[PDB]
DNA sequence: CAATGCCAACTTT
DNA sequence: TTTGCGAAGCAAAAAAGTTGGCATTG
């Protein structure tokens, strides 16, 4: 066939799976970027390299290797149902990425709550939530008072259906947070179904917390290593404070994973003990 | 205005 | 992260999170 004509067969495939709603997303994404960087021909090999090559160009080295698995893939579905013979894909390289996200460290997350005194209350408090309970902050957007039972916070975080129940009594100490604490403030202050609500007592969109964490990143006027900080890296910020405020144990629990094997990189501290001196 | 949601195109987990 | 394939560790699969730009409405 053509290559787009197939991509069409392919994307019908793929719907099916049991993927869910944002995967099947991303990786329509990836073949809508196949689409525009190469021909409809039928059949290339350098003609593949040449339009990767062209990510890895403008550094976009994670979206490279992520499409070149997802052409490989179109091309052994097409190979099975006997269109092509051929992966010219895997004569192809896999190209290399590295996080340029920079960890965030306990002494840059107070300068970032202060300038964050510039913004509603809930990004605060929904800063001192996503610590204290390391959870992604697509599930702290879905924390409904009625989750609270028995001094349990109980989560089944969406990106895995892990299912944990986080005690309230808990508390960071190196940072003076207390859960119950927080919790008090996001009843009295924000008052809403949700834990974490919105200045009209509404729910909250991850993408929201996100943004407005950035905000007051960058009003913060601090400086990094490649990639600042998001907000998701409260969550290693958690995870690295209770592991040498309780144990290794405890953060793999409270971060939760499926696995039951503490590999864990939220523990990796990635460089920030490293102190690159500036040049003034 | 300013707070938010949505689509998109990247990067991370 | 989690799974997979090969049996130690990366590559790939699945499912996020990040944030600019446009549009909407208190």
Same mark, same amino acid.
């Given at each position: 066939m053509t290559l787009h004509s197939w991509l069409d067969r392919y994307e019908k495939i793929l719907?099916?799976?049991? %993927?869910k709603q944002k995967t099947l997303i991303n990786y329509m994404s990836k073949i809508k970027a196949i689409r525009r960087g190469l021909p409809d021909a039928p059949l290339t090999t350098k003609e593949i390299a040449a339009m990767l090559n062209g990510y890895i160009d403008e550094g976009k080295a994670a979206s490279a290797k992520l499409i070149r698995s997802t052409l490989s893939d179109a091309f052994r579905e097409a190979i099975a149902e006997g269109?092509?013979?051929?992966?010219?894909?895997?004569?192809?390289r896999a190209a290399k990425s590295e996080v340029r996200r920079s960890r965030l460290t306990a002494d840059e997350y107070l300068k970032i709550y202060q300038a964050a005194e510039?913004?509603?209350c809930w990004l605060r408090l929904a800063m001192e939530l996503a610590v204290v309970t390391g959870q992604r902050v697509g599930d702290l957007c879905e924390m409904?008072?009625?989750? %609270?039972v028995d001094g349990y916070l109980y989560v089944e975080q969406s990106k895995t259906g892990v299912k944990i129940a986080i005690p309230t009594a808990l508390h960071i100490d190196a940072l003076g947070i207390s859960m119950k604490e927080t919790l008090d403030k996001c009843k009295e202050i924000?008052?809403?179904?949700?834990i974490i609500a919105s200045t009209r007592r509404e729910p909250l969109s991850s993408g929201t917390v996100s943004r407005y964490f950035m905000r007051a990143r960058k009003a913060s006027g601090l400086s990094f290593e490649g990639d600042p900080p998001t907000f998701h890296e409260l969550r290693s910020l958690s995870a690295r404070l209770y592991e040498k405020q309780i144990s290794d144990k405890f953060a793999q629990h409270l971060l939760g994973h499926?696995?039951?094997?503490?590999?864990?990189?939220?523990?990796?501290d990635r460089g920030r003990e490293w102190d690159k001196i500036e040049i003034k």
């Amino acid at each position: 066939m053509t290559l787009h004509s197939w991509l069409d067969r392919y994307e019908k495939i793929l719907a099916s799976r049991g %993927i869910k709603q944002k995967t099947l997303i991303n990786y329509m994404s990836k073949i809508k970027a196949i689409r525009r960087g190469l021909p409809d021909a039928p059949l290339t090999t350098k003609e593949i390299a040449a339009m990767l090559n062209g990510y890895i160009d403008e550094g976009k080295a994670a979206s490279a290797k992520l499409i070149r698995s997802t052409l490989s893939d179109a091309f052994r579905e097409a190979i099975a149902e006997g269109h092509i013979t051929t992966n010219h894909v895997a004569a192809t390289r896999a190209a290399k990425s590295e996080v340029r996200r920079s960890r965030l460290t306990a002494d840059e997350y107070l300068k970032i709550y202060q300038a964050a005194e510039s913004s509603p209350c809930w990004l605060r408090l929904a800063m001192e939530l996503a610590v204290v309970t390391g959870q992604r902050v697509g599930d702290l957007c879905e924390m409904k008072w009625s989750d %609270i039972v028995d001094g349990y916070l109980y989560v089944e975080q969406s990106k895995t259906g892990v299912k944990i129940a986080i005690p309230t009594a808990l508390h960071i100490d190196a940072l003076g947070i207390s859960m119950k604490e927080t919790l008090d403030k996001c009843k009295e202050i924000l008052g809403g179904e949700t834990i974490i609500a919105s200045t009209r007592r509404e729910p909250l969109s991850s993408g929201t917390v996100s943004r407005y964490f950035m905000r007051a990143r960058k009003a913060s006027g601090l400086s990094f290593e490649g990639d600042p900080p998001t907000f998701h890296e409260l969550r290693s910020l958690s995870a690295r404070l209770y592991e040498k405020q309780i144990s290794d144990k405890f953060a793999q629990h409270l971060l939760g994973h499926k696995s039951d094997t503490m590999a864990s990189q939220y523990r990796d501290d990635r460089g920030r003990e490293w102190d690159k001196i500036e040049i003034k």
